[PDB]
Ligand binder design. Structure first.
Ligand SMILES: *[C@@H]1O[C@H](CO)[C@@H](O[C@@H]2O[C@H](CO)[C@@H](O[C@@H]3O[C@H](CO[C@H]4O[C@H](CO)[C@@H](O)[C@H](O)[C@@H]4O)[C@@H](O)[C@H](O[C@H]4O[C@H](CO)[C@@H](O)[C@H](O)[C@@H]4O[C@H]4O[C@H](CO)[C@@H](O)[C@H](O)[C@@H]4O)[C@@H]3O)[C@H](O)[C@H]2NC(C)=O)[C@H](O)[C@H]1NC(C)=O
Ligand SMILES: *[C@@H]1O[C@H](CO)[C@@H](O[C@@H]2O[C@H](CO)[C@@H](O[C@@H]3O[C@H](CO[C@H]4O[C@H](CO)[C@@H](O)[C@H](O)[C@@H]4O)[C@@H](O)[C@H](O[C@H]4O[C@H](CO)[C@@H](O)[C@H](O)[C@@H]4O)[C@@H]3O)[C@H](O)[C@H]2NC(C)=O)[C@H](O)[C@H]1NC(C)=O
Ligand SMILES: *[C@@H]1O[C@H](CO)[C@@H](O[C@@H]2O[C@H](CO)[C@@H](O[C@@H]3O[C@H](CO[C@H]4O[C@H](CO)[C@@H](O)[C@H](O)[C@@H]4O)[C@@H](O)[C@H](O[C@H]4O[C@H](CO)[C@@H](O)[C@H](O)[C@@H]4O)[C@@H]3O)[C@H](O)[C@H]2NC(C)=O)[C@H](O)[C@H]1NC(C)=O
Ligand SMILES: *[C@@H]1O[C@H](CO)[C@@H](O[C@@H]2O[C@H](CO)[C@@H](O[C@@H]3O[C@H](CO[C@H]4O[C@H](CO[C@H]5O[C@H](CO)[C@@H](O)[C@H](O)[C@@H]5O)[C@@H](O)[C@H](O)[C@@H]4O)[C@@H](O)[C@H](O)[C@@H]3O)[C@H](O)[C@H]2NC(C)=O)[C@H](O)[C@H]1NC(C)=O
Ligand SMILES: *[C@@H]1O[C@H](CO)[C@@H](O[C@@H]2O[C@H](CO)[C@@H](O[C@@H]3O[C@H](CO[C@H]4O[C@H](CO[C@H]5O[C@H](CO)[C@@H](O)[C@H](O)[C@@H]5O)[C@@H](O)[C@H](O)[C@@H]4O)[C@@H](O)[C@H](O)[C@@H]3O)[C@H](O)[C@H]2NC(C)=O)[C@H](O)[C@H]1NC(C)=O
Ligand SMILES: *[C@@H]1O[C@H](CO)[C@@H](O[C@@H]2O[C@H](CO)[C@@H](O)[C@H](O)[C@H]2NC(C)=O)[C@H](O)[C@H]1NC(C)=O
Ligand SMILES: *[C@@H]1O[C@H](CO)[C@@H](O[C@@H]2O[C@H](CO)[C@@H](O)[C@H](O)[C@H]2NC(C)=O)[C@H](O)[C@H]1NC(C)=O
Ligand SMILES: *[C@@H]1O[C@H](CO)[C@@H](O[C@@H]2O[C@H](CO)[C@@H](O)[C@H](O)[C@H]2NC(C)=O)[C@H](O)[C@H]1NC(C)=O
Ligand SMILES: *[C@@H]1O[C@H](CO)[C@@H](O[C@@H]2O[C@H](CO)[C@@H](O)[C@H](O)[C@H]2NC(C)=O)[C@H](O)[C@H]1NC(C)=O
Ligand SMILES: *[C@@H]1O[C@H](CO)[C@@H](O[C@@H]2O[C@H](CO)[C@@H](O)[C@H](O)[C@H]2NC(C)=O)[C@H](O)[C@H]1NC(C)=O
Ligand SMILES: *[C@@H]1O[C@H](CO)[C@@H](O[C@@H]2O[C@H](CO)[C@@H](O)[C@H](O)[C@H]2NC(C)=O)[C@H](O)[C@H]1NC(C)=O
Ligand SMILES: *[C@@H]1O[C@H](CO)[C@@H](O[C@@H]2O[C@H](CO)[C@@H](O)[C@H](O)[C@H]2NC(C)=O)[C@H](O)[C@H]1NC(C)=O
Ligand SMILES: *[C@@H]1O[C@H](CO)[C@@H](O)[C@H](O)[C@H]1NC(C)=O
Ligand SMILES: *[C@@H]1O[C@H](CO)[C@@H](O)[C@H](O)[C@H]1NC(C)=O
Ligand SMILES: *[C@@H]1O[C@H](CO)[C@@H](O)[C@H](O)[C@H]1NC(C)=O
Ligand SMILES: *[C@@H]1O[C@H](CO)[C@@H](O)[C@H](O)[C@H]1NC(C)=O
Ligand SMILES: *[C@@H]1O[C@H](CO)[C@@H](O)[C@H](O)[C@H]1NC(C)=O
Ligand SMILES: *[C@@H]1O[C@H](CO)[C@@H](O)[C@H](O)[C@H]1NC(C)=O
Ligand SMILES: *[C@@H]1O[C@H](CO)[C@@H](O)[C@H](O)[C@H]1NC(C)=O
Ligand SMILES: *[C@@H]1O[C@H](CO)[C@@H](O)[C@H](O)[C@H]1NC(C)=O
Ligand SMILES: *[C@@H]1O[C@H](CO)[C@@H](O)[C@H](O)[C@H]1NC(C)=O
Lengths: 445, 127, 445, 127, 127
């Protein structure tokens, strides 16, 4: 006859949720991500290829993207907790035009000091986007935008916002399955699976309408969407050739520190050296059109012989209507209207520098996670700053038209902040290993 | 010699040769900051211990602790699976077999405890 | 010969103390008890009856009552930690009579705003109990009572004080013994023991002089006291018939929100609508004084043929001299003198609605745990509110007289806040199970 | 079939037939808020593991791990208990017997360790 | 009878008789304040369990759980040490030997694992 036997360490698994811990090449200056407290990554991470194995993946229903979003938000608040709170900055501001070019305002206002029985009158420039008029009259009066909803916390100047890579690892008794299928769209049964105890270097780069410093497609421009035919679902596309983008802040400000209270100070831009210059970003036109034509023809496969037409983003908040990013200290907000402005036919071929220019705006008071209140004041970085990024992905949205026309418009939509993480975690999934297995055999012989 | 979890696609008969690598990886800065990363690491370490103990305690009561393979006294009921021994041990893999016993897994576990406990009482306890 | 043998999983236990965790039917709006973070309770909790077992119980020396008291206090402070602190409210208040009926006062006072360089003058009603004059004369310059001891923290309006049930569970390797003896007084050897991993639904209903929404007696009015003859020990009595009690707040207040600072506001009773009406509670006289006869005769068994007399609270703080409770947002303070006012002689027999009316007072500033400082401000609930409760227990106290007379007087004593929990946890006790056991036998045969 | 701890009142002989049910219940949201309830839950989980390990490690050194019932080489000293072998396994219960050996429980544990350790060295370690 | 770790200086042959005392001390207010001292105590308690399990799990896979001394099927290699069987057991101490096999400690562990699994595979699994 046969007897039931139990096998320990059987190679089986199931989908499960767990608390993933961080791992990093620790090496020092601190960062907003607090990677100094993270576990040190191994020098030679182990990766194994599963033969004869095919596993199902679902990047939209993945739990890693949701868990990482909470961790990033938690780390963001943790770094701002010990910094000074700009509670006395909520006062009437008297501004005048600086000595378009009206982006700045030379404001003056009263302020306290270490001595409680004494006050001081100071002055400092302020971007127009960070100021709101009071009474809608008497142009001199002005108020900080966040003042009537929350008191923003000044970021500590000692910590930098460098997005160094961080590896997400699973606890003992769990594993992360990686799909190595060529040109995998992120959903379906993967024909080339592999396992790894920790994900590759994930850089928590925050961007809208354009993924920067992200992964690159191996051989072909990949497109991902839970429902391509649905106009209410964001469309993520990954490029094969990185499109280098240059940015600069020609304004040369002077950092001035004023002590608002005992043992604390507020940083602001004192004056400006030279004439006022608008901030912008550059990108090669030849290497940009090309990407589109390739993206346009690729999108054509999912909509018949229809012509693709990219148009500038729809109206709304500045965070969603412009390409937001950060050059390691300053939050930028560029137009992008110059990149998604063209029409491609079923034969349209793109066929010198001629670099495109994107005007940009800069703000100090920001809401990175779109939460009510909980704002942060970004101190000004002294001197001119420049930063180059690698554009590897785009966030597109299809207009909700009747679809019966001979074309279709695509708008660069900001989507959700979680989409940025989903573009990199699509090649992973966490599973729980059940080493206890049962099977029969003619034992007891 | 395949790495950890490398014999998942192999047949059931060939997968039993590497049980040691999977059983070894079940549990593999001294200070703790109790921060965002520290809190998660603490939960991960505690969760790992519970996962191993929860799975290890079953072998102890079943009388198979310290053994990678063991045979129980519970006979194999044909109702759970009427497939032959050759196909399961030389053609089917563990993943496919997992989706066939899952329904009767809880019942099998309960039957093994009473089968081992009764034999334990019958053998020992001379009076 | 005989050899020593060890048995694992032996059914033995001993008294111990452990950190009990919360379990609840989790399902959303938040609450002060923070049940959202509690473990979800099982749908079919396992309960087993022990045959041939008799265990000793002592609800007075129990540890769960003390442990639960700390947990409730800790949860109360945790819920109030993120709420706004009413530190600027400590200012001189000029009040006048509202346009007995002098329970309210239309006060006015200066206050700050989001703009640190500007101030505002506001007005709002205030109960006379939460107001104390600064100086005997001037008939103005009133001050909030708690101002000279601590700054009260305004309760977050998003969280409610619903006393939803919570189940106390023991960790693995421990169990909670339940006594199922009929009419058990809480002390002695229980002749009907049972075991359960988690206690029944415990509702943290804070009350004084009258237990509300508590468990009802099984068959007879039970009385509990560590020393019935001692005059300094509180006496707890459990009823069999739930005496329904209704309460109402006929004052239709108008909530008005004023921004005290950046991103924070203070919500105060704004203006009354209609006319001033005294808050009160109702209770059936036939059903109320009928139970007194049953309670009076039951108490007679412990003091011979002496007659029982009920008198009103001796005197003292408002929290101990009145029946305090909360109708899901407003804390009431009702005078019970209309209930504990009667004399019962051995033959006395109670023999239409005729509902009794209990005048009540309302306060915004309160100290739930009688702790110095750490006060709390309850925001006003808009509109009229009503709430019905089930009176199932009473906290009585016997006068410290010579007791040589032919009668005895009982007073509704507030006792201690822990008595409220002890009235429900008397049927449980935590024990530590020791699976290791030793016993001999003629082994090695 | 009684549930967990349902045979506490039964005699010593009949109460040992269900040791598996009490031994199984010795260890039975992924995120943690670390609040009032979270802190208590974390302590409860950690305390539970220590209680099991503290009791399981003794069986390991005693040479009885993975066995519910086992016999040692330590002879039974009549001084600890002079009661007959019939009433103990047919009339007395575990609770009543626990309040009679508690005084000598610590000494019995040490005798078993030295007996098992000495026997291990005498049998193994040929040279 | 020397106390805990009292036979460290004694020779190998004389130090193997008291292994039980060192093995017993490997795991030896209910509330927790989570303060400076509470945080350290929590980490210490968790670290102790991991240290014991990390060392105990190796014996389980090796098939030596529940035993203090056990002989494996891996033959000794003279390359690791060419000393005689008399000097090591009657003259050298454990500390001096620990600084001689450390270079081959990891290699010996892997050899024992595959040797135990193969023997398990060969003996059990009748078909
Ligand atoms: C840091 O903090 C300091 C100290 O608080 C602060 O200084 C004060 O600033 C305020 C705001 O600018 C000044 O207010 C002005 O003061 C003068 C003087 O008022 C005195 O004299 C008049 C005339 O006798 C009296 O009525 C009065 O009681 C005082 O004694 C006035 O000229 C100003 O009134 C005009 O402006 C007001 C605001 O718009 C109007 O409401 C008012 O109607 C007046 O309007 C003006 O323009 C009209 C045409 O549109 C014209 O018809 C009017 O006649 C008039 O010209 C105003 O009240 C105040 O004086 C400052 N000094 C002191 C000691 O308080 C700093 O400003 C602050 N700094 C910063 C950077 O925030
Ligand atoms: C996409 O990826 C690219 C490549 O990593 C990023 O580009 C870099 O961005 C960082 C900021 O995020 C730049 O960092 C800054 O560079 C300044 C210039 O560096 C040169 O000159 C200094 C001497 O002046 C040399 O030491 C250095 O090796 C270079 O030759 C530095 O002056 C800055 O210093 C400040 O930050 C550091 C780090 O915290 C502090 O230690 C300093 O004290 C000081 O505060 C800073 O290092 C970097 O130069 C950029 N590289 C390039 C090639 O441009 C993109 O930012 C990234 N895009 C996004 C959106 O993430
Ligand atoms: C002893 O036990 C009794 C029985 O549980 C308690 O009585 C209840 O007390 C609660 C407050 O603690 C009362 O709750 C409130 O009821 C209002 C009326 O409810 C009826 O009408 C609404 C629509 O208007 C229906 O949806 C509902 O089903 C009923 O038909 C609600 O309007 C109140 O809602 C507001 O407050 C809650 C809590 O903050 C919010 O979640 C809501 O969004 C809203 O803002 C509220 O639900 C309840 O009605 C009472 N029941 C009875 C039968 O009277 C006693 O309070 C309890 N005693 C003690 C001392 O604990
Ligand atoms: C925003 O708006 C503010 C004003 O609201 C601007 O700040 C002022 O800017 C002006 C113009 O730059 C500053 O005044 C200038 O200072 C130059 C430097 O002066 C040098 O010589 C001085 C000689 O000393 C005597 O004279 C001075 C001036 O009367 C007295 O203060 C002394 O006591 C002596 O009597 C030195 O003191 C000084 O340190 C220099 O060495 C000067 O060349 C110019 O002619 C002019 O006077 C003014 O001081 C600024 N105020 C403050 C508080 O900073 C600000 O720049 C605006 N920002 C922008 C970007 O537009
Ligand atoms: C506590 O004490 C405070 C005062 O210290 C009480 O508050 C005041 O209560 C009175 C009486 O209710 C309020 O005055 C009333 O306002 C009514 C408004 O109705 C409409 O007509 C108005 C007419 O406008 C002209 O006149 C008003 C002043 O009368 C000017 O402000 C306007 O600019 C115009 O010139 C409109 O303003 C208004 O928008 C309506 O359309 C009015 O009908 C009544 O005759 C009376 O005047 C008074 O405003 C309250 N003050 C505040 C700051 O709220 C409070 O009620 C007391 N509480 C209790 C419980 O007694
Ligand atoms: C599964 O994916 C892996 C990814 O590495 C493929 O690996 C091959 O690796 C060899 C050795 O480095 C390269 O020469 C090949 O070019 C890789 N192949 C490809 C297609 O990139 C592996 O071949 C894949 N397997 C299948 C069946 O597609
Ligand atoms: C991603 O690729 C998978 C296949 O790998 C696509 O899944 C197919 O979707 C079509 C839709 O008509 C179904 O008919 C097929 O049965 C699906 N196949 C499988 C294997 O699931 C999926 O639609 C692709 N997604 C996108 C956005 O292109
Ligand atoms: C994906 O989206 C398509 C539409 O793009 C859905 O198919 C139909 O969509 C129309 C509107 O265009 C709806 O009125 C229909 O109800 C949809 N059909 C159904 C059956 O619901 C489609 O359902 C979406 N989902 C999938 C899985 O394809
Ligand atoms: C997207 O492009 C359109 C192009 O027309 C912008 O629309 C306007 O352009 C005309 C001419 O310059 C102005 O007079 C209007 O004021 C613009 N406003 C609108 C909303 O029509 C449009 O603003 C662009 N959108 C963004 C977000 O850049
Ligand atoms: C995309 O196709 C639509 C539909 O043909 C174009 O819009 C129509 O263009 C005709 C041109 O004569 C107008 O008469 C219609 O009123 C337009 N709208 C509709 C609803 O039919 C649209 O212009 C095309 N876009 C491009 C630039 O190719
Ligand atoms: C609760 O009931 C127990 C009995 O179940 C009472 O116990 C007796 O109390 C008297 C007090 O003089 C003692 O003389 C008896 O020996 C006690 N009997 C037992 C079995 O303990 C206890 O007093 C009751 N408590 C109250 C105050 O009602
Ligand atoms: C319980 O209370 C009674 C009194 O109600 C205590 O008994 C004695 O009471 C008289 C006064 O009536 C005191 O003078 C005695 O001192 C009390 N006895 C003792 C020994 O102090 C009784 O002792 C209290 N406790 C118990 C367990 O019954
Ligand atoms: C890019 O596209 C435009 C049309 O949008 C076309 O005129 C141009 O020739 C293309 N190529 C370059 C190099 O600009
Ligand atoms: C972006 O550029 C377009 C022109 O290409 C202009 O109409 C629009 O107003 C600009 N807006 C922003 C956000 O810069
Ligand atoms: C075998 O399984 C069947 C179907 O569940 C059941 O009726 C039968 O009792 C089982 N036999 C044994 C011996 O357990
Ligand atoms: C103990 O309970 C069992 C089970 O009901 C019963 O058979 C036995 O007679 C009881 N013994 C005593 C002494 O009550
Ligand atoms: C309570 O009410 C009675 C009348 O019912 C009254 O005589 C007594 O003074 C009141 N005392 C209070 C407020 O406690
Ligand atoms: C009842 O008893 C009291 C004494 O306790 C006595 O005064 C009264 O007259 C009696 N009356 C009746 C109705 O028995
Ligand atoms: C038995 O117990 C007695 C009393 O404690 C003690 O004197 C005696 O030495 C013990 N005998 C053995 C063999 O342990
Ligand atoms: C069995 O136990 C009972 C209860 O303690 C006792 O009365 C009886 O004498 C005992 N019988 C024997 C034979 O020991
Ligand atoms: C013994 O050790 C030597 C030297 O490291 C090595 O070459 C040889 O293979 C080993 N032999 C065995 C049987 O492991």
């Amino acid at each position: 006859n046969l007897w039931v036997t139990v096998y320990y360490g059987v190679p089986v698994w199931r989908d499960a949720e767990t608390t993933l811990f961080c791992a990093s090449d620790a090496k020092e200056k601190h960062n907003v991500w607090a990677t100094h407290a993270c576990v040190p990554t191994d020098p030679n991470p182990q990766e194994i290829h599963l033969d004869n194995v095919t596993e199902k993946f679902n990047m939209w229903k993945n739990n890693m993207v949701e868990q990482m979003h909470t961790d990033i938000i938690s780390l963001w608040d943790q770094s701002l907790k010990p910094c000074v709170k700009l509670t006395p900055l909520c006062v009437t501001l008297h501004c005048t035009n600086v000595t378009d070019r009206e982006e700045l305002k030379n404001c003056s206002f009263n302020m306290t000091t270490e001595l409680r029985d004494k006050r001081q009158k100071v002055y400092s420039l302020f971007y127009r986007l960070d100021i709101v008029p009071i009474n809608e009259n008497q142009g001199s009066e002005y108020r900080l935008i966040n003042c009537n909803t929350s008191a923003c916390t000044q970021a500590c100047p000692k910590v930098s916002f460098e997005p160094i890579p961080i590896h997400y690892c699973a606890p003992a008794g769990f594993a992360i399955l990686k799909c190595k299928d060529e040109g995998f769209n992120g959903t379906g049964l993967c024909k080339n699976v592999s396992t790894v105890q920790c994900t590759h270097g994930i850089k928590p780069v925050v961007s809208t309408q354009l993924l920067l410093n992200g992964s690159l497609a191996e051989k072909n421009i990949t497109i991902r969407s839970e429902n391509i035919t649905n106009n209410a679902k964001i469309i993520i596309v990954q490029l094969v050739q990185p499109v280098t983008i240059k940015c600069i802040r020609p304004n040369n400000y002077t950092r001035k520190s004023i002590r608002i209270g005992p043992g604390q100070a507020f940083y602001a831009m004192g004056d400006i050296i030279g004439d006022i210059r608008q901030a912008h970003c550059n990108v090669s036109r030849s290497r940009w059109n090309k990407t589109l034509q390739e993206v346009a023809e690729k999108l054509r496969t999912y909509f018949g012989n229809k012509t693709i037409i990219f148009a500038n983003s729809s109206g709304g908040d500045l965070e969603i209507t412009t390409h937001s990013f950060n050059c390691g200290g300053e939050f930028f907000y560029c137009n992008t209207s110059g990149l998604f402005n063209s029409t491609w036919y079923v034969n349209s071929t793109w066929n010198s520098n001629d670099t495109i220019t994107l005007p940009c705006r800069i703000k100090q008071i920001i809401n990175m996670w779109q939460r009510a209140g909980q704002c942060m004041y970004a101190p000004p970085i002294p001197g001119v700053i420049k930063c180059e990024s690698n554009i590897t992905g785009l966030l597109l949205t299809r207009d909700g038209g009747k679809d019966n026309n001979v074309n279709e418009t695509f708008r660069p939509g900001g989507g959700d902040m979680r989409d940025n993480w989903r573009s990199e975690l699509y090649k992973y999934k966490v599973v729980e290993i059940e080493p206890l297995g049962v099977a029969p055999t003619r034992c007891k012989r | 010699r395949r790495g950890f979890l490398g014999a998942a696609g192999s047949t059931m008969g060939a997968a039993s040769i590497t049980l040691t690598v999977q059983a070894r990886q079940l549990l593999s800065q001294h200070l703790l900051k109790l921060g965002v990363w520290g809190i998660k690491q603490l939960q991960a370490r505690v969760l790992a211990v519970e996962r191993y103990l929860r799975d290890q305690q079953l072998l102890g009561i079943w009388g198979c602790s310290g053994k990678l393979i063991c045979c129980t006294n519970v006979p194999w009921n044909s109702s759970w699976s009427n497939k032959s021994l050759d196909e399961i041990w030389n053609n089917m893999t563990w993943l496919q077999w997992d989706k066939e016993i899952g329904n009767y897994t809880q019942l099998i576990y309960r039957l093994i405890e009473e089968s081992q406990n009764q034999q334990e009482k019958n053998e020992k306890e001379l009076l």
